[PDB]
A paper describes a structure:
Our crystal structures revealed that more van der Waals contacts were formed by a Pro residue in the PPPP and NPND motifs compared to an Ala at the same position in the PAPP and NAND motifs. Consequently, the epitopes of the NAND, NPND and Mixed peptides had a slightly greater buried surface area (BSA; 753, 762, and 765 Å2, respectively) than the PAPP peptide (743 Å2), which only consists of Ala-containing motifs. In particular, Pro10 of the PPPP motif found in the NAND and NPND peptides forms more van der Waals interactions with antibody residues H.Asn33 and H.Tyr52 compared to Ala10 of the PAPP motif present in PAPP and Mixed peptides. Similarly, Pro6 of the NPND motif in the NPND and Mixed peptides makes additional interactions with antibody residue K.Leu50 that are not present for Ala6 of the NAND motif within the PAPP and NAND peptides. Minor differences exist in the N- and C-termini of the peptides, presumably because the termini are largely unrestricted in the crystal structures compared to the cryoEM structure.
Circumsporozoite protein (CSP) is the most abundant protein on the surface of Plasmodium sporozoites, and is necessary for parasite development in mosquitoes and establishment of infection in host liver cells. Flanked by N- and C-terminal domains, CSP contains an unusual central region consisting of multiple, short (4 to 8) amino acid (aa) repeats. Similarly, the central domain of PbCSP contains an array of PPPP and PAPP motifs interspersed with NPND or NAND motifs. Importantly, the central region of CSP is highly immunodominant and antibodies targeting the repeats can inhibit sporozoite infectivity by preventing parasite migration and attachment to hepatocytes.
Residue numbers in the entry:
A (entry chain L): 1 to 27, 27A, 27B, 27C, 27D, 27E, 28 to 214
B (entry chain H): 3 to 52, 52A, 53 to 82, 82A, 82B, 82C, 83 to 95, 101 to 216
C (entry chain P): 1 to 13
């Protein structure tokens, strides 16, 4: 098979920076009709791929002219003259000249931006869920950068371990931030043993840790 | 564009059939490709059919496993994969001309489907920041992925974060979907999360009401 | 917008 070698694996760039991605094929991609079937795709986080370029250099309709494709034979390059926030995601090359059709391994483009503190929210468990015998408490950190954030649960000022799960969003295509949820789950009997439920957030954009808390039954 | 059929739960050893409906370009003029995406997000070509004459070509890895057809009267392409194993759980895409489908997630598992319970994440003084309020829905205890979440039947999209699901220690999935809105109008606006889980044929709408605390 | 370029050549028959 014809191997597509794509570098770098990751591009971490600032808004306005040029970027370049290389794709090298293990054999020539020149077909017998004289055309070279080399395509570039972008798969933004969460989405299906979208073709940007075909026949090495030909932009698809609606692709901005900040993108250019060049190359011949075995060495190909996709360039972005000035990176914009919506350019993040994973770029792939793929060749259509040989069988099997093959793809490069992908280049992840991530955006570096200024530090932004999270907004922090907490949610008590619903009455409907409590009636069913479980209490889920959710702490939400919205629209922050960088991605690293420390979220601690404290129940009556005791640090918790072992009963929470986190999930982080993909980087945002407009403001290049992340959001994070932390969910503490207890049985209803355990939830009712304690009064104060708090989540404490440490992040580079915060001058000191932020705590959101409630008293069981106040809500 | 290319519109793929919904997610599928299929037993080990059984087969799956998925579809790709084409519009906005000449279906019979371009090869229709099918592509598997691995968990590490590699892309692996399965094969194509050229709808103009029916010819197919396959990756040798899938020959004898994949069948590709094309209905030119309805501009719809189909892929069947037989003898499924754990390594066939993946998102499958169709692709043709400049377009890619949205993907069909196939989960190979002998476990029963389970639809989600949906609980409000109610806005309150404890979910206010800078004059904005956050609210959401907690979508708990379903199998397999995916659930889809919209707000106000798709009319509400700005400010929404639907988180990647987590795998709970039960083997069931959970996710939350949250939105930030003005705190000033929680008494006049309505926020309903719409949760759909195709494998269990589950559809739930939940109006998220504020708490008074 | 003219028709999109092919990703790859169609087969003969």
């Amino acid at each position: 098979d014809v191997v597509m070698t794509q570098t770098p694996l990751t591009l971490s760039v600032t808004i306005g920076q040029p970027a370049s991605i290389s794709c090298k094929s293990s054999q020539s991609l020149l077909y017998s009709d004289g055309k070279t079937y080399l395509n570039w795709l972008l798969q933004r986080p969460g989405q299906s791929p979208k073709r940007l370029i075909s026949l090495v250099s030909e932009l698809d309709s609606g692709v901005p002219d900040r993108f250019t494709g060049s190359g011949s034979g075995t060495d190909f390059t996709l360039k972005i003259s000035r990176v914009e926030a919506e350019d993040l995601g994973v770029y792939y090359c793929w060749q259509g000249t040989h069988f099997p059709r093959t793809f490069g391994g992908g280049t992840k483009l991530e955006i570096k931006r200024t530090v932004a503190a999270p907004s922090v929210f907490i949610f008590p468990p619903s009455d409907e869920q409590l009636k069913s015998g479980t209490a889920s408490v959710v702490c939400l950190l919205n629209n922050f950068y960088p991605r690293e954030a420390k979220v601690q649960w404290k129940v009556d000022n005791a640090l918790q371990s072992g009963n929470s799960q986190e999930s982080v969003t993909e980087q945002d295509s407009k403001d290049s931030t992340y959001s994070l949820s932390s969910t503490l789950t207890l049985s209803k009997a355990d939830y009712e043993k304690h009064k104060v439920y708090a989540c404490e957030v440490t992040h580079q954009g915060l001058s000191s840790p932020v705590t959101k808390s409630f008293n069981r039954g106040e809500c | 564009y290319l519109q793929q059929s919904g997610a599928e739960l299929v037993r080990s050893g059984a087969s799956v059939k998925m579809s790709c409906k084409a519009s906005g370009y000449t279906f019979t003029s371009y090869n229709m490709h099918w592509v598997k995406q691995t968990p590490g997000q590699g892309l692996e070509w399965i094969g194509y059919i050229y709808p103009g004459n029916g010819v197919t070509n396959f990756n040798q890895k899938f020959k004898g496993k994949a069948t590709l057809t094309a209905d030119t009267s309805s501009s719809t392409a189909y892929m069947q994969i037989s003898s499924l194993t754990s390594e066939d759980s993946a998102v499958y895409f169709c692709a043709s001309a400049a377009y890619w489908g949205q993907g069909t997630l196939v989960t190979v598992s002998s476990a029963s489907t389970k639809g989600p319970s949906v609980f409000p994440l109610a806005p309150s003084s404890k979910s206010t920041s800078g004059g904005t309020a956050a609210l959401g829905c907690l979508v708990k205890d379903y199998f397999p992925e995916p659930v889809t979440v919209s707000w106000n039947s798709g009319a509400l999209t700005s400010g929404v974060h639907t988180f990647p699901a987590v795998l709970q220690s039960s083997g069931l999935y959970s996710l939350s979907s949250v939105v930030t809105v003005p705190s000033s109008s929680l008494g006049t606006q309505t926020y309903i999360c719409n949760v759909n889980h195709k494998p269990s044929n589950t559809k739930v709408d939940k109006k998220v009401e504020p708490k008074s605390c | 917008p003219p028709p999109p370029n092919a990703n790859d050549p169609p087969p003969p028959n």
